[PDB]
Symmetry: C3
């Protein structure tokens, strides 16, 4: 019976070493998942920056265009007034609003940072275990 107890003790100790190895892997997975998610966060911030920049450029361009056409139309009409013509000199002078939208990922970036933090609180305490 003494032998049998030595065997069970041998099994238990071998199993623990493997279980510690397994949980070490798990900690590596958590670390790498966290890193990956942090990289995705960065990419998302960079996307918003460029997308919002492009929206601002579009808005500013449209504003300038509207002024250009207004000035041009004013000039053309004044020329027409001088020429005594029945033809219309008041076309091409205006620009409709084009509905430029913007990206705000504030809520999403915040939740993503939050999950990253809580993920990093999931690490197994291996020293306690093994």
């Amino acid at each position: 019976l003494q032998e049998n107890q030595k065997i069970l003790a041998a099994s238990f100790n071998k199993a623990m070493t493997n279980i510690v190895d397994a949980f070490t892997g798990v900690n590596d997975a958590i670390t790498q998942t966290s890193q990956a998610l942090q990289t995705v966060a960065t990419a998302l911030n960079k996307i918003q920056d460029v997308v919002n920049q492009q929206g601002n450029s579009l808005n500013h361009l449209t504003s300038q265009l509207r002024q250009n056409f207004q000035a041009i139309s004013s000039s053309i009409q004044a020329i027409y007034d001088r020429l005594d013509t029945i033809q219309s000199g008041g076309r091409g002078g205006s620009l409709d609003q084009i509905n430029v939208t913007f990206l705000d990922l504030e809520y999403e970036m915040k939740k993503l940072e939050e999950a990253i933090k809580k993920l990093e609180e999931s690490y197994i305490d291996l020293k306690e275990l093994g």
Copy 2:
């Protein structure tokens, strides 16, 4: 008998710690899943804004083309009235702009499938302890 009770004690201690470690795993699965779902929403919003901006751009160029045509016609009519060899027909056109759109439908489907399978992987803590 003495050796047995120390062994049973080791086993119970190990089980407590193992169940605790798997609890950490389940939390990690939950937070990974939450993170991916949040990324999914961000991707959807990015697509909406990118496609809106492509529509705004097409809509702008469309109006611009009409404005340049009307302006060019007026200038040509003035040149015709003035009896001039100088060209009144320049600045009247816009070349095609080539606006493209984003379609993440396939990616969104695969991401959802991966999130659902992730959430099938929880450890049954009650079975274990």
Copy 3:
């Protein structure tokens, strides 16, 4: 008495081992699916960059044509009268992020539990 307790201990150990290998099997599936999810996000980010940079190019090409049309129109008007801003398009470059993301995915896939060693 003593043998009876020893059988219960062996039984407890085997049952726990069975449950532990099943649990780590789940862990491996979680690793697989997290990896898949991240590769899918990666593809999405590449497609976003493509469409964003194309739209930036279109905007530049447009602005270029516009400056020329306005110069021509301005010349025409001035000639009739005689007879009588920089748009900063930025571009998205995720190359560093894509490289780090790929590194994390590869290393995550190096964390699989060896179920055979455990079992």
